[PDB]
């Protein structure tokens, strides 16, 4: 599906450089679902943060493919003492400082890196959130990145992937230079990283016309 790997990455970088650093820019015209998205994410995550036996901590989270901080602002900062962000697009990290407002003072690092080149620091994160970005990595780079994420989790920490699933196979989007993979492909890549699947949910009440969205909690 991906013929030229260098062009797969360079075309995506070029695409994102000219997108407006706004919520509707992040979501490709679907800004009107942002809060519906975040509310489901919060319910999916909060189970793991409950006092419980092996509770996931609330000290630090990493937001991967964070953009301007849409998720950091309304999902992660209210739940974690500190948040780090990583994104390839410099204009989005610059805008995040303004978009996040006062509570953005609790964002520690604004890492500018492609996930395929990024190593999260060992024993650093209670939650690593990876939303709407796995389609920008090749299958091998995705598996390798997920393995590096596993090494950066604190005790009881989790990785969450939330993304679009194709009906069947792998579909390349030539506009933004990303792939949409079917559920069985995604589950296979997750397993290959040595991650166990702890929770899984298809999101409800999104628009009829978009691909299904699944969330996976992993460790």
């Amino acid at each position: 599906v991906i013929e030229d790997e260098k062009q797969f990455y360079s075309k995506a970088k070029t695409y994102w450089k000219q997108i407006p650093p706004t919520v509707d820019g992040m979501l490709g015209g679907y800004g009107h679902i942002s809060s519906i998205d975040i509310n489901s994410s919060r319910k999916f995550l909060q189970r793991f943060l409950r006092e419980g036996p092996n509770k996931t901590g609330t000290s630090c989270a990493l937001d991967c493919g964070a953009g301007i901080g849409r998720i950091t602002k309304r999902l992660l900062l209210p739940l974690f003492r500190e948040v780090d962000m990583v994104d390839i697009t410099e204009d989005f990290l610059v805008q995040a400082k303004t978009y996040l407002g006062e509570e953005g003072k609790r964002v520690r690092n604004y890492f500018c890196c492609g996930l395929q080149d990024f190593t999260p620091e060992p024993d650093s994160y209670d939650v690593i959130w990876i939303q709407w970005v796995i389609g920008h990595l090749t299958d091998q780079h995705l598996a390798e990145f997920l393995r590096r994420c596993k090494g950066s989790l604190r005790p009881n920490g989790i990785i969450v992937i939330k993304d679009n699933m194709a009906q069947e196979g792998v579909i390349l989007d030539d506009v933004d230079s990303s792939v949409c993979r079917d559920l069985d492909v995604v589950r296979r890549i997750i397993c290959s990283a040595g991650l166990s699947l702890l929770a899984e949910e298809r999101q409800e009440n999104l628009p009829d016309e978009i691909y299904h969205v699944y969330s996976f909690a992993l460790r």
Binding site: W132, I171, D173, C180, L206, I210, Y211
Partner: peptide, 6 residues
């Protein structure tokens, strides 16, 4: 973000 089915 989300994607309209192609």
């Amino acid at each position: 973000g989300p994607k309209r089915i192609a």
